[PDB]
């Protein structure tokens, strides 16, 4: 408890020394814009100190950061202030019944094991019915946006000589008519789009060193002639590609973007089976086009269950191979010895530094092309990461290396490990992720070697499954250890002001998703309570509990029923955009605007980056 | 063994003896009519041997059987082929690998565990495939039916003063324009259907005795004015009823039936989610005017979800009330020693020849309006009966009572007991049901004491259960015991062509499904899989065989993912009615019937018994 105290005071030493600088740089007008992002995006800016920060963030309010900053931001924020509705009343009946142990105790505390996920499960019911009934408002208040107008059909039959843009055309002027607006065929356009990546990537290097010699160019082995013959052959190249992209047969996809004249018509289209074979005319709601991960698509579907299968081996192969550094973090939490059990988290979170780079990596050629849906299956691995190596792997590594009750009483020890690390990694990882030192430094960079700033989004696939993370440390710790649960407690506060801060500020949305992730954050919150309660039976069975095991056996029962409960009675909010919703939405829209001329406005929506 | 010879004997001799009775009936004329049902349902037909019975069953061709007599009852006839198929080959081969076992030969017919589950699986594959090809095919080549018109709204909100009928009528005007043809509300009528059925019961009661005295009235205490009282209460009870019903605000319910002009309309109403709050406005593939079950309509959605909980619990108190007849049973099965261990098996069909009937009632209970989907939840919880308390019920109460490899060594001794069970029930049992000894007699005591057939329908949920009971048997015991095998496959045979000859005769569709029961005959065999091979382990646990485990891991591992497959694969088949399917079916009707003035047509079809 020493070591966890100089954890504790080290990393609230980091996070007020990152506060510090971070007030300062905020202070400082030339690196400005990496700090306010949004007001710039939105151009409403252009062109004791800490006291005046955290509190400012807090002064929005919640409908108006909504219309700011998209629904899917503030309801991250809401998974933050959910931690804190969950664990704050956790909190308060842990350490309630944390002075007595500190046998009869065990039945005196699995009842608050009870309390603690029956309230979980109140405000998770409670919160859930929240961000759906604001999703909805949300959806029935957001204007104009293509992804409510339109559909993506995945799987079409290629087997007629005739084209697929036309196919599709038939297809949906026969089967939906006075609806079927407008189709647009997805391009592999794949190789083009990484062509011009590749274009525009050389030709910042080469502005690099066109800004960089002014009297007598240097031209660097690694000439900027090569630089010149990358634009040459690159160009040459983008010729021959658009030669190909405007020919039909090889530069199609089986995909297209199926608009309609109604979002009703969208929805039904959405919502329903196509064709008889469900192996093709799947229609999934298509997401915005500055959503949709463009290289993701142009992708056989018959060849994306094979990638989803082939990255489920990557990921056993990743925690598998990923479990030597998580044991090496484990030996290391196992004067300076408390250095060590800080370095211990320290080394874990940067060994989990590229882990939701790689994870994004792994969704993309997971076959998902809204990068919406790509950072919430990113995150949801990320998560059965966490689950299955960062608090299983973690603490049987730690159960195995304090050989070096046998696991049961090992747990609670390894909780002190994960207090240093929410310290090292919610506390100061967190207070660091303010200072955004590689954004800020890629602008810097990017300024000194016009404006496109190109913050970053709010990182859903890397904060999110960290939440999830301490949702699970806090839930199976709740009613084993309570001494990590202030701890939790104050990172959730931490987190929610910092994130609703960058949310205000810097953060933009990449994805303009309408909160579609949280039943994904509920389907794993909630598995956290099945995971704390599958786990705390695996620690009143070794301690020789009789009385414990079953309501222990009763309680994720109806944990997971709760959950089918908040699936059925709230899913269709997220999942289903529903029919009347749809049709009021639209009926409300055309009494608006009564012409809407939407036929070119949708069909030039999904083309490609051109 | 002897014991099973003489069962086997025994049964063997009483289908035959029923045969020869069964051939008697048939050929005496006057009762006839309860031998052809169908031919008289269709008026086709009016007004040494035994070869001359099978071989006609089968002179019947495929699809002129699904024209004749629906697709739900060809489909389990496929359902009895497909035992078929999946228990000749896999008898084959287990008889190719039980002469050497009658240690390493374990490991040699793990592998043909492995290949009577691929098999098994291959089988269900083509055959899923099949049956909704056929059910798809039926779909589109099935006529005008309000069933494909329409939908069933469930739950609306009753919060408005202004009435349910022009509420749901204005709810689909707005969201389904061009498209909402007709609302039908379902009244409460559930009092005055009982009332009429009351009514038309005493009717033919008082009938009984108006043709029994004919010369002096006798009227029995238990007079024929008691009758005459009957009829003239229940008649100013009918018009009190009709009173009632002509009224708005207590007889309607929250449900309505909602037509559409366009099949394809009824289809995205059926597929979609419809309002924000999914606990209302739920949108039901509506089944035929004489498929739903109007008693269990006319019941609060919000009291559903309770109905059915309290009816698990029955199911419940059911299984471990019902495991001490399970019990006599098995006590009963372990010369007249193998009567004895026959009278087990008799014994059991004695105690289950009830157990169909109180499942109806629980599922008639359970709130499912459609009595085609309310046979398939009652065939799916008669087989959740016969899974764990008729066959791990039974093989537990064997594993038992041998103490009077501990249960390991005893359930291929409870395999003996399921052959002579497979010989009364599977052999005599349906043998006796060709019979038809109850709808014989009630005919005969209906004409003696016009036209009123009403035969019985196919019994889906009487039948069906027993053949995934005996899918349960012959794969738990292809990899044990494979003694069992030809018995179950020569009463796929039998069962086969006898329920094909009833089909074919007798049997009508009393609810007109589209085989929509195959994905839960699907969703159970496998489940007799999974059942299988978690059992198996279970057998090659507890004999110290350490190789097998894996093999028995990866294998029911295979099968749930093959069962994933194929749901996500032709499950949308069944059900989800695609809109391609609707609007080329539209198409169709439209061009062959220009007028078609449907609206009078669906309005007036689900009305209600009257």
């Given at each position: 408890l020493k070591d966890i105290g100089v954890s504790a005071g080290i990393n609230i030493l980091t996070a007020f020394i990152f506060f510090i600088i971070f007030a300062f740089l905020r202070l400082q007008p030339f690196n400005d814009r990496v700090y306010f992002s949004k007001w710039y995006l939105r151009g409403l800016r252009s062109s004791l100190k800490?006291?005046?920060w955290m509190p400012e963030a807090l002064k929005m309010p919640e409908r108006e950061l909504i219309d700011h900053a998209g629904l899917d931001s503030v309801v991250y924020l809401r998974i933050y202030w959910l931690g804190l509705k969950i664990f704050a009343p956790i909190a308060m009946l842990a350490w309630a019944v944390l002075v007595p142990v500190n046998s009869n105790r065990f039945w005196a505390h699995i009842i608050m094991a009870y309390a603690f996920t029956i309230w979980t499960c109140y405000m998770l019911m409670k919160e859930y019915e929240t961000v759906a009934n604001m999703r909805l408002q949300f959806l029935a208040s957001e204007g104009r946006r293509p992804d409510q107008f339109t559909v993506l059909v995945r799987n079409v039959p290629p087997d007629p000589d005739e084209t697929v843009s036309e196919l599709v055309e038939h297809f949906f002027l026969v089967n939906h008519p006075d609806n079927y607006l407008t189709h647009q065929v997805v391009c592999n356009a794949n190789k083009l789009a990484d062509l011009v990546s590749k274009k525009t990537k050389l030709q910042n290097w080469l502005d690099y060193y066109q800004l960089k010699?002014?009297?007598?160019?240097?031209?660097?082995?690694?000439?900027?002639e090569h630089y010149i013959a990358e634009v040459d052959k690159t160009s040459k190249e983008i010729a021959e590609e658009r030669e190909n992209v405007v020919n039909d047969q090889k530069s199609v996809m089986p995909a297209s973007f199926v608009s309609f004249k109604t979002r009703w018509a969208a929805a039904v289209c959405a919502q329903t089976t196509q064709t008889r074979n469900p192996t093709e005319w799947l229609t999934e709601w298509a997401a915005e086009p500055r959503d949709i991960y463009w290289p993701n698509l142009a992708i056989p579907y018959v060849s994306l269950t094979v990638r989803r299968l082939v990255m489920n081996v990557a990921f056993f192969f990743l925690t598998f191979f990923f479990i030597i550094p998580i044991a090496f973090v484990q030996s290391l939490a196992t004067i300076k010895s408390l250095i060590q059990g800080l370095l211990a988290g320290i080394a874990l979170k940067l060994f989990l530094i590229f882990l939701p780079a790689i994870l994004m990596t792994m969704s993309k050629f997971e076959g998902f092309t809204s990068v919406s849906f790509l950072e919430r299956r990113s995150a949801s691995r990320y998560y059965i990461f966490n689950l299955v190596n960062v608090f299983l792997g973690s603490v049987i590594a730690g159960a195995a290396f304090e050989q070096?009750?046998?696991?049961g009483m090992a747990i609670p020890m390894k909780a002190t490990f994960f207090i240093t690390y929410i310290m090292v990694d919610g506390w100061a990882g967190v207070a660091g992720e303010i200072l955004m030192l590689k954004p800020l430094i890629i602008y810097h960079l990017k300024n000194a070697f016009e404006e496109a700033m190109n913050?970053?989004?709010?990182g859903f696939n890397t904060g999110e499954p960290q939440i999830q993370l301490y949702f699970l440390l806090g839930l199976v710790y709740a009613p084993v250890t309570p001494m990590l649960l202030p701890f939790i407690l104050v990172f959730f506060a931490l987190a929610y002001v910092v994130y609703r801060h960058q949310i205000i500020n810097v953060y933009n949305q990449e994805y303009e998703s309408a909160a579609a992730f949280w039943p994904d954050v509920h389907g794993r919150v909630i598995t956290a309570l099945i995971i704390s309660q599958l786990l705390l039976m695996g620690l009143l069975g070794t301690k020789h509990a009789a009385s414990a095991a079953p309501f222990l056996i009763a309680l994720p029962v109806i944990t997971i029923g709760f959950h089918r409960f908040c699936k059925g009675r709230f899913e269709p909010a997220f999942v289903r955009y529903p029919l009347q919703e749809a049709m009021m939405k639209d009926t409300l829209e055309r009494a608006r605007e009564p012409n809407l001329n939407l036929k070119g406005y949708l069909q030039d929506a999904y083309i490609h980056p051109v």
């Open positions: 800490f006291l005046h010699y002014t009297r007598n160019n240097s031209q660097i082995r690694p000439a900027i070096l009750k046998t696991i913050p970053g989004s709010i």
